[PDB]
Amino acid sequence: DPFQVAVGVSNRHIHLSRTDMDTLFGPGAELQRKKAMKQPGQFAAEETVTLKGPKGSLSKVRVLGPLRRETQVEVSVADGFALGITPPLRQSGQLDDTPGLTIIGPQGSVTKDHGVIVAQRHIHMHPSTAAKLGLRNGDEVDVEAGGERGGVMHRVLIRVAEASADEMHIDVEEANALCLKNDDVVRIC
Amino acid sequence: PFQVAVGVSNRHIHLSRTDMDTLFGPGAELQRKKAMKQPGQFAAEETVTLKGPKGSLSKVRVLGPLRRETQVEVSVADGFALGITPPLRQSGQLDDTPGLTIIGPQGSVTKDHGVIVAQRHIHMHPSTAAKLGLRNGDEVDVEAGGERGGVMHRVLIRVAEASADEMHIDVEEANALCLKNDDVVRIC
Ligand SMILES: CC(C)(COP(=O)(O)OP(=O)(O)OC[C@H]1O[C@@H](n2cnc3c(N)ncnc32)[C@H](O)[C@@H]1OP(=O)(O)O)[C@@H](O)C(=O)NCCC(=O)NCCS
Ligand SMILES: CC(C)(COP(=O)(O)OP(=O)(O)OC[C@H]1O[C@@H](n2cnc3c(N)ncnc32)[C@H](O)[C@@H]1OP(=O)(O)O)[C@@H](O)C(=O)NCCC(=O)NCCS
Ligand SMILES: [Zn+2]
Ligand SMILES: [Zn+2]
Ligand SMILES: [Zn+2]
Ligand SMILES: [Zn+2]
């Protein structure tokens, strides 16, 4: 079924700028690959950080490479409460009016004034696949999950880009609410 | 009409008298902290620590009153934190379930069973069930609006006299829908 798409489940994690990488891991430090993600060029790094909010901290928070233009922190709704912040629900890069927190690495720390979000679900899709399915960048679709916690997710954003692999991204709470894990399959309706 | 209020459940425990005595002392009684929506049910002041093969969860709320048999309700995520795989179950369906060590102020007990991931359900008063043409054991689709809107399939209807109209979901199910206590969802 060509409308079936693989699931990628995201635990809390961070993307770093070079300025913050330098602060956290030392000047000129380079991320080490641990595991490639499904999206071209993206990977889980060996490196981890601590996130510290007004209420508490989350440790062993995975860094995702490569480095980006701007630091971005993705956490679950649950994580927000543990941290003591209220991150808005956003697509990647949509960081206007977002809270920050303190990031701690082995060689230093920095207190960000912004950049923390709850990740809004979405489907990455290659232009060829989009053509075959009749979808365009920015379309919203329903997505159905089978099984014991089966259901439908409404108005899921389609992100079409040449450097993309066909994959739906949801966070760990969204996945557990559907009894899904990495490489499970869902269906675009 | 077909609208029902949401009740969101964090991890918690229901205790037997035998286990209550061990954990909190012989003849100890639960102290009421807050009434739940369901008649007779309440969050207690008492809390325990849950300990599994991999790790522990602390400040786990006890729900009263005491029951015939200890039952532990945790999230899928909680299962991974503890190091067990609880099946998805309705309350009281505890055959072939894993256990845990329950740690209290006056003692501890290692249970050989009783931990579940709570399966979502709607508590419904018989009058309400009548109005909606629903009977006990029926399954229904439930829709949530908002920015994580969607539909939950095959939600079990639990009719009983001592019930209030309320959907019960766990904290991950709620956060996956950006719902909290007293938000309204709709039976399809
Ligand atoms: C079951 C219940 C009593 C659990 O007790 P509890 O854990 O003490 O409940 P609380 O609401 O006080 O939870 C407080 C914690 O949840 C956190 N929290 C708040 N919103 C949260 C969210 N959306 N996601 C994750 N955590 C959240 C708080 O930060 C707090 O953390 P802290 O203790 O470290 O300060 C409670 O969930 C409840 O009353 N549910 C109503 C639904 C119901 O009736 N269930 C019946 C089960 S049979
Ligand atoms: C984002 C990512 C790299 C985060 O790295 P990570 O946190 O190190 O990932 P892991 O899968 O190894 O998480 C392992 C932890 O999750 C726990 N875990 C496993 N399944 C779980 C579940 N269903 N619910 C909660 N926790 C779970 C494990 O017990 C373990 O905890 P521990 O470290 O205390 O032992 C990872 O989630 C991922 O690879 N996602 C793929 C999807 C993707 O590409 N997202 C990109 C977003 S831009
Ligand atoms: Zn990310
Ligand atoms: Zn993504
Ligand atoms: Zn319960
Ligand atoms: Zn219930």
Author numbering:
A (entry chain B): 36 to 224
B (entry chain A): 37 to 224
Publication excerpt:
Not only does PduL facilitate substrate level phosphorylation, but it also is critical for cofactor recycling within, and product efflux from, the organelle. Structurally, PduL consists of two domains (blue/red), each a beta-barrel that is capped on both ends by short α-helices. β-Barrel 2 consists mainly of the central segment of primary structure (β2, β5–β9; residues 47–60 and 82–154) (red), but is interrupted by a short two-strand beta sheet (β3-β4, residues 61–81).
We collected a native dataset from rPduLΔEP crystals diffracting to a resolution of 1.54 Å. A CoA cofactor as well as two metal ions are clearly resolved in the density (for omit maps of CoA see S2 Fig). CoA and the metal ions bind between the two domains, presumably in the active site. The second (Zn2) is in octahedral coordination by three conserved histidine residues (His157, His159 and His204) as well as three water molecules. This hypothesis is strengthened by the fact that the CoA-bound crystals were obtained without added CoA, indicating that the protein bound CoA from the E. coli expression strain and retained it throughout purification and crystallization. SEC-MALS analysis of rPdulΔEP is consistent with a dimer (as observed in the crystal structure) with a weighted average (Mw) and number average (Mn) of the molar mass of 58.4 kDa +/− 11.2% and 58.8 kDa +/− 10.9%, respectively. rPduL full length runs as Mw = 140.3 kDa +/− 1.2% and Mn = 140.5 kDa +/− 1.2%.
